Design an enzyme around this catalytic site. Structure first.
Site, PDB file in Angstrom:
ATOM      1  N   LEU A 234       0.831  -1.221   0.000  1.00  0.00           N
ATOM      2  CA  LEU A 234       0.000   0.000   0.000  1.00  0.00           C
ATOM      3  C   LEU A 234       0.874   1.284   0.000  1.00  0.00           C
ATOM      4  CD1 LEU A 234      -2.986  -0.983   2.368  1.00  0.00           C
ATOM      5  CD2 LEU A 234      -2.865  -1.546  -0.030  1.00  0.00           C
TER       6      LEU A 234
ATOM      7  N   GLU B 243      -8.806   1.169   9.209  1.00  0.00           N
ATOM      8  CA  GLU B 243      -9.112   0.963   7.779  1.00  0.00           C
ATOM      9  C   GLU B 243      -8.992  -0.511   7.386  1.00  0.00           C
ATOM     10  OE1 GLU B 243     -10.352   1.169   4.022  1.00  0.00           O
ATOM     11  OE2 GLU B 243      -8.378   0.343   4.242  1.00  0.00           O
TER      12      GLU B 243
HETATM   13  N1  LIG Z   1      -5.572   0.139  -1.782  1.00  0.00           N
HETATM   14  C1  LIG Z   1      -6.344  -0.949  -2.020  1.00  0.00           C
HETATM   15  O1  LIG Z   1      -7.527  -1.001  -1.777  1.00  0.00           O
HETATM   16  C2  LIG Z   1      -5.759  -2.125  -2.794  1.00  0.00           C
HETATM   17  C3  LIG Z   1      -4.417  -2.127  -3.184  1.00  0.00           C
HETATM   18  N2  LIG Z   1      -3.903  -3.240  -3.922  1.00  0.00           N
HETATM   19  C4  LIG Z   1      -2.460  -3.147  -4.369  1.00  0.00           C
HETATM   20  O2  LIG Z   1      -2.394  -3.117  -5.916  1.00  0.00           O
HETATM   21  C5  LIG Z   1      -1.204  -3.928  -6.295  1.00  0.00           C
HETATM   22  C6  LIG Z   1      -1.594  -5.231  -6.957  1.00  0.00           C
HETATM   23  O3  LIG Z   1      -2.428  -4.803  -7.991  1.00  0.00           O
HETATM   24  P1  LIG Z   1      -2.271  -5.011  -9.619  1.00  0.00           P
HETATM   25  O4  LIG Z   1      -0.854  -4.806  -9.980  1.00  0.00           O
HETATM   26  O5  LIG Z   1      -3.349  -4.167 -10.240  1.00  0.00           O
HETATM   27  O6  LIG Z   1      -2.472  -6.675  -9.847  1.00  0.00           O
HETATM   28  P2  LIG Z   1      -3.634  -7.789  -9.756  1.00  0.00           P
HETATM   29  O7  LIG Z   1      -3.802  -8.190  -8.358  1.00  0.00           O
HETATM   30  O8  LIG Z   1      -4.853  -7.423 -10.594  1.00  0.00           O
HETATM   31  O9  LIG Z   1      -2.883  -8.981 -10.455  1.00  0.00           O
HETATM   32  C7  LIG Z   1      -2.699  -8.889 -11.876  1.00  0.00           C
HETATM   33  C8  LIG Z   1      -2.409 -10.278 -12.427  1.00  0.00           C
HETATM   34  O10 LIG Z   1      -3.657 -11.214 -11.962  1.00  0.00           O
HETATM   35  C9  LIG Z   1      -4.020 -11.918 -13.171  1.00  0.00           C
HETATM   36  N3  LIG Z   1      -5.261 -11.168 -13.641  1.00  0.00           N
HETATM   37  C10 LIG Z   1      -5.717  -9.918 -13.353  1.00  0.00           C
HETATM   38  N4  LIG Z   1      -6.936  -9.773 -13.905  1.00  0.00           N
HETATM   39  C11 LIG Z   1      -7.273 -10.949 -14.492  1.00  0.00           C
HETATM   40  C12 LIG Z   1      -8.368 -11.434 -15.215  1.00  0.00           C
HETATM   41  N5  LIG Z   1      -9.465 -10.679 -15.447  1.00  0.00           N
HETATM   42  N6  LIG Z   1      -8.326 -12.725 -15.660  1.00  0.00           N
HETATM   43  C13 LIG Z   1      -7.304 -13.551 -15.443  1.00  0.00           C
HETATM   44  N7  LIG Z   1      -6.244 -13.118 -14.776  1.00  0.00           N
HETATM   45  C14 LIG Z   1      -6.206 -11.832 -14.320  1.00  0.00           C
HETATM   46  C15 LIG Z   1      -2.582 -11.891 -13.592  1.00  0.00           C
HETATM   47  O11 LIG Z   1      -1.937 -13.120 -13.780  1.00  0.00           O
HETATM   48  P3  LIG Z   1      -1.411 -13.825 -14.895  1.00  0.00           P
HETATM   49  O12 LIG Z   1      -0.138 -13.032 -15.553  1.00  0.00           O
HETATM   50  O13 LIG Z   1      -0.799 -15.004 -13.938  1.00  0.00           O
HETATM   51  O14 LIG Z   1      -2.512 -14.284 -15.829  1.00  0.00           O
HETATM   52  C16 LIG Z   1      -2.202 -10.512 -13.992  1.00  0.00           C
HETATM   53  O15 LIG Z   1      -0.815 -10.343 -14.416  1.00  0.00           O
HETATM   54  C17 LIG Z   1      -0.383  -4.084  -5.009  1.00  0.00           C
HETATM   55  O16 LIG Z   1       0.353  -2.844  -4.856  1.00  0.00           O
HETATM   56  C18 LIG Z   1      -1.439  -4.202  -3.904  1.00  0.00           C
HETATM   57  O17 LIG Z   1      -0.874  -3.754  -2.669  1.00  0.00           O
HETATM   58  C19 LIG Z   1      -4.727  -4.366  -4.287  1.00  0.00           C
HETATM   59  C20 LIG Z   1      -6.066  -4.324  -3.878  1.00  0.00           C
HETATM   60  C21 LIG Z   1      -6.584  -3.239  -3.148  1.00  0.00           C
HETATM   61  N1  LIG Z   2     -10.722  -0.437   1.785  1.00  0.00           N
HETATM   62  C1  LIG Z   2      -9.827  -1.363   1.476  1.00  0.00           C
HETATM   63  N2  LIG Z   2     -10.021  -2.081   0.355  1.00  0.00           N
HETATM   64  C2  LIG Z   2      -9.190  -3.067   0.009  1.00  0.00           C
HETATM   65  N3  LIG Z   2      -9.378  -3.831  -1.049  1.00  0.00           N
HETATM   66  C3  LIG Z   2      -8.091  -3.303   0.813  1.00  0.00           C
HETATM   67  C4  LIG Z   2      -7.218  -4.331   0.446  1.00  0.00           C
HETATM   68  C5  LIG Z   2      -6.093  -4.569   1.238  1.00  0.00           C
HETATM   69  C6  LIG Z   2      -5.123  -5.732   0.773  1.00  0.00           C
HETATM   70  N4  LIG Z   2      -3.926  -5.927   1.637  1.00  0.00           N
HETATM   71  C7  LIG Z   2      -3.891  -6.531   2.838  1.00  0.00           C
HETATM   72  C8  LIG Z   2      -4.931  -7.339   3.303  1.00  0.00           C
HETATM   73  C9  LIG Z   2      -4.826  -7.936   4.565  1.00  0.00           C
HETATM   74 CL1  LIG Z   2      -6.089  -8.923   5.187  1.00  0.00          CL
HETATM   75  C10 LIG Z   2      -3.711  -7.765   5.380  1.00  0.00           C
HETATM   76  C11 LIG Z   2      -2.668  -6.966   4.921  1.00  0.00           C
HETATM   77  C12 LIG Z   2      -2.744  -6.350   3.664  1.00  0.00           C
HETATM   78 CL2  LIG Z   2      -1.381  -5.380   3.155  1.00  0.00          CL
HETATM   79  C13 LIG Z   2      -5.897  -3.748   2.371  1.00  0.00           C
HETATM   80  N5  LIG Z   2      -6.741  -2.758   2.732  1.00  0.00           N
HETATM   81  C14 LIG Z   2      -7.859  -2.523   1.970  1.00  0.00           C
HETATM   82  N6  LIG Z   2      -8.728  -1.540   2.274  1.00  0.00           N
END
Ligand SMILES: NC(=O)C1=CN([C@@H]2O[C@H](COP(=O)(O)OP(=O)(O)OC[C@H]3O[C@@H](n4cnc5c(N)ncnc54)[C@@H](OP(=O)(O)O)[C@@H]3O)[C@@H](O)[C@H]2O)C=CC1
Ligand SMILES: Nc1nc(N)c2cc(CNc3cc(Cl)ccc3Cl)cnc2n1
EC number: 1.5.1.3
Length: 186
Positions: free
Chosen positions: A22, A30
């Site tokens: 993050l 959060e």
């Molecule tokens: N602030 C927040 O709420 C959140 C933050 N994050 C963060 O975002 C980052 C990870 O995100 P991101 O880079 O976007 O990657 P993803 O988690 O979307 O992973 C991408 C990979 O998943 C597969 N993939 C994604 N979409 C599809 C699909 N529709 N069908 C099949 N396979 C798929 C892959 O594998 P393949 O090459 O093996 O096919 C592709 O290379 C991290 O920094 C994490 O910390 C993540 C969620 C929430």
């Molecule tokens: N609102 C919101 N939405 C999301 N999709 C989020 C996703 C994450 C994913 N990361 C994470 C997950 C666990 Cl359980 C523990 C440590 C980590 Cl770093 C973290 N915070 C989130 N907040």
């Protein structure tokens, strides 16, 4: 199967990730909110399903994987089987959503939560249908390398209140944030 939902926390400059982590320091309440929202199933004898990309799966500390109390589905076209600790693997979002209608899952899934990352959010958000976005607005810019897609406010209505979601400004570690809920149906 119940509702379809995205949940994300996002900075002012639309940032959700930096180097598989993050962009901001740990915000403990959060995290608690994320857990509460994805885990709480409105229907007895059912769990919610969490859907995430491969990189999102591996971004979760191993001890926190699988997300407990929830069914865990990973999206990947490279992997040939679910990652260690994951429950299901699909090759696309449509495939994932289709699986929840199968013998094995029809009866077991309440709400489905898309929890990341960018391209899975994007696709979900532009797919016709009834969809909600649970978005925590982190009210500062943070250096990021992964971003939340554009929210089209012609389709996504910001709800004026939502049961269980705090409406006032929150603050952890000097970082102000607020919870929002959006809804489309098209
Ligand atoms: N602030 C927040 O709420 C959140 C933050 N994050 C963060 O975002 C980052 C990870 O995100 P991101 O880079 O976007 O990657 P993803 O988690 O979307 O992973 C991408 C990979 O998943 C597969 N993939 C994604 N979409 C599809 C699909 N529709 N069908 C099949 N396979 C798929 C892959 O594998 P393949 O090459 O093996 O096919 C592709 O290379 C991290 O920094 C994490 O910390 C993540 C969620 C929430
Ligand atoms: N609102 C919101 N939405 C999301 N999709 C989020 C996703 C994450 C994913 N990361 C994470 C997950 C666990 Cl359980 C523990 C440590 C980590 Cl770093 C973290 N915070 C989130 N907040």
């Amino acid at each position: 199967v119940g509702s379809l939902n995205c949940i994300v926390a996002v900075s002012q400059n639309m940032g959700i990730g930096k180097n598989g982590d993050l962009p901001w320091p740990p915000l403990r309440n959060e995290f608690r909110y994320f857990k509460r929202m994805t885990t709480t199933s409105s229907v007895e004898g059912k769990q919610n399903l969490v859907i995430m990309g491969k990189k999102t799966w591996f971004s979760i500390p191993e001890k926190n994987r699988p997300l407990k109390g929830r069914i865990n589905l990973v999206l990947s076209r490279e992997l040939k089987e679910p990652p260690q600790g994951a429950h299901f693997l699909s090759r696309s979002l449509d495939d994932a959503l289709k699986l929840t209608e199968q013998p094995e899952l029809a009866n077991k899934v309440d709400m489905v939560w898309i929890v990341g990352g960018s391209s899975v959010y994007k696709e979900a958000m532009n797919h016709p249908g009834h969809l909600k976005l649970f978005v925590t607005r982190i009210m500062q810019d943070f250096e990021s390398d992964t971003f939340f897609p554009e929210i089209d406010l012609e389709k996504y209505k910001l709800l004026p209140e939502y049961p269980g979601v705090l409406s006032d400004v929150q603050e952890e570690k000097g970082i102000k944030y607020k919870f929002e809920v959006y809804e489309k149906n098209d």
